Amino acid sequence: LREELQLLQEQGSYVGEVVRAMDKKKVLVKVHPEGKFVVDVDKNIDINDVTPNCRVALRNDSYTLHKILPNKVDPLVSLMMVEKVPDIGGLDKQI
Amino acid sequence: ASKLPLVTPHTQCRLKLLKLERIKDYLLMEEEFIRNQEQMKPLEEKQEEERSKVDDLRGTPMSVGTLEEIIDDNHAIVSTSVGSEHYVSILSFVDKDLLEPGCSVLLNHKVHAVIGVLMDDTDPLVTVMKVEKAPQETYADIGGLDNQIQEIKESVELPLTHPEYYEEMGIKPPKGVILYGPPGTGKTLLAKAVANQTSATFLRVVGSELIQKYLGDGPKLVRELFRVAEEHAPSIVFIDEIDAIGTKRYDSNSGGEREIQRTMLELLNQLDGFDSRGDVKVIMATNRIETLDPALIRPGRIDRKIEFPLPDEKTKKRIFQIHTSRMTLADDVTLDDLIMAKDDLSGADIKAICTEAGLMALRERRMKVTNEDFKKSKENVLYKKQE
Amino acid sequence: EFLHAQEEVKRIQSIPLVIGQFLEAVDQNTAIVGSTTGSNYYVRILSTIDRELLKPNASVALHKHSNALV
Numbered sequence A: 001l002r003e004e005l006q007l008l009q010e011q012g013s014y015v016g017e018v019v020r021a022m023d024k025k026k027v028l029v030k031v032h033p034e035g036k037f038v039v040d041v042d043k044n045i046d047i048n049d050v051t052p053n054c055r056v057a058l059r060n061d062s063y064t065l066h067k068i069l070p071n072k073v074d075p076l077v078s079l080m081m082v083e084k085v086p087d088i089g090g091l092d093k094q095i
Numbered sequence B: 001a002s003k004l005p006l007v008t009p010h011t012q013c014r015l016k017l018l019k020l021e022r023i024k025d026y027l028l029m030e031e032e033f034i035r036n037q038e039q040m041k042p043l044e045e046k047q048e049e050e051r052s053k054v055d056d057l058r059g060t061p062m063s064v065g066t067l068e069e070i071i072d073d074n075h076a077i078v079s080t081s082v083g084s085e086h087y088v089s090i091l092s093f094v095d096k097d098l099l100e101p102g103c104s105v106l107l108n109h110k111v112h113a114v115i116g117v118l119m120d121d122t123d124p125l126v127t128v129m130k131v132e133k134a135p136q137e138t139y140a141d142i143g144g145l146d147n148q149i150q151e152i153k154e155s156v157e158l159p160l161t162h163p164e165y166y167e168e169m170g171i172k173p174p175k176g177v178i179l180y181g182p183p184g185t186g187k188t189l190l191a192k193a194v195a196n197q198t199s200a201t202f203l204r205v206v207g208s209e210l211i212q213k214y215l216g217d218g219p220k221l222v223r224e225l226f227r228v229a230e231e232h233a234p235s236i237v238f239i240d241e242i243d244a245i246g247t248k249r250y251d252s253n254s255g256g257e258r259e260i261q262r263t264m265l266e267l268l269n270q271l272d273g274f275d276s277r278g279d280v281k282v283i284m285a286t287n288r289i290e291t292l293d294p295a296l297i298r299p300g301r302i303d304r305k306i307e308f309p310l311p312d313e314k315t316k317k318r319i320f321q322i323h324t325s326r327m328t329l330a331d332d333v334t335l336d337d338l339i340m341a342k343d344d345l346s347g348a349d350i351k352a353i354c355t356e357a358g359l360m361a362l363r364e365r366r367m368k369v370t371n372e373d374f375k376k377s378k379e380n381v382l383y384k385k386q387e
Numbered sequence C: 001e002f003l004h005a006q007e008e009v010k011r012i013q014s015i016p017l018v019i020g021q022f023l024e025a026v027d028q029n030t031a032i033v034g035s036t037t038g039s040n041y042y043v044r045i046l047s048t049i050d051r052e053l054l055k056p057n058a059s060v061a062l063h064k065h066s067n068a069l070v
């Protein structure tokens, strides 16, 4: 508790989305309103970890990746179409 | 890469042997003299020294910019993602050859200098219009065409395959080809056949799709079409169904029809107006042939007009045999019952027959084949034409 | 000493912070917020806030310099 007062006297943690990476441990990431940047990856993170269309913790000074933030929900997978129990006067001929 | 421009002998001239033997001994000499570098002093101060030095000279946050204009040698005008446009100089690090307007670029933070260039994507248009792979059957699928195949072959296939007849005389090949005849003839068959057995790119085009609710794109679609076909690679363009879209100026009216007149106009000048395209193969499909614009009909635009006849009883026995090749066949059937009876039935009709068998027999889930399958099938297609 | 600790953290606000909106949280004491400045950020949170106040993008405040959920 006593130490935090300076800790949250801190700023720079940007948030990004990776379109896709390329060679030399780099990626292509667009910012929320802004354009797309080619940046550096973190020593603790892996290139194979970088999946396209995923958020990443960004620096504000060097825009260095801090942590590949988890997706919310795969929207098609949250809107996954129903496979309910598949159990009509007028509709028998077309049957 | 452009090691020697001379190809002038075009033969086994001792000139050429002297040429390629000299170039050979030069290459060996270079490979050996450079070979004696890693022998006396094999060193590696030219991989990560220059690469690392410039990777640190240039920056991280590699802001992606957009080219606007090119001026002189080093300074150009760029545009940021929002519109802030800077008069920034470029480094001798990016390929100056692949640097044209309308291209993504890499910029610096402080000076915003052009650092690198981003390679372009594959445009959606190619994915939309180009038949990506060999779509359908090869030359085992023909019902019958020999003069057609000859014309299209020596017009396209023989030229590209063996380009040692046209540069002997300096005679260029014919440009345009009109494939016409009654419907259901197999125009799609031959087009997809040459597209199957081919070495250059292929494009398929429909004509009904050249009408926008927006006003006057049209020739936009045409010009971008031929632009992609030309810029992409050796291009084999194919447009089917130009008859219901480019016939003639029937009444010289307005309101959409005039728009189509403008569009086919742009397909005319764009077809061949100025500074001849080159490596631009063009092939056109039509059902009717008389209601066509003769300005497109004239030479320069189309040099081969091919008729599509309808065989009578000779190739039909192979058409029923192809459309019945991959199917059971009980001994109760004989193809001559229907092949030896008519003499104009289209291959589309043989297809509707040999498929109508697959509908009849297995609608009832009976055994392989019966002769009445071909009887009711042939009569059914008889009402398919007659009705 | 702990109760003296909670109060002394209170100097961080001082009022003029910013009006933003909570968006989502990745994990313990760190979340994402889209400010009314048009942009979006990744931030930490104070341990004082009760975690029952979340859900449907609540109105939140943030530091000018730090831009942290206070």
Ligand SMILES: Nc1ncnc2c1ncn2[C@@H]1O[C@H](COP(=O)(O)OP(=O)(O)O)[C@@H](O)[C@H]1O
Pocket: B141, B142, B143, B144, B182, B183, B184, B185, B186, B187, B188, B189, B287, B319, B346, B347, B348, B349, B351
């Ligand atoms: N000689 C043939 N051998 C096999 N199939 C044929 C033959 N002639 C026509 N067909 C069938 O008829 C159809 C007509 O093709 P095509 O002439 O390209 O259509 P359209 O006349 O509408 O342009 C083809 O898809 C093919 O399946």
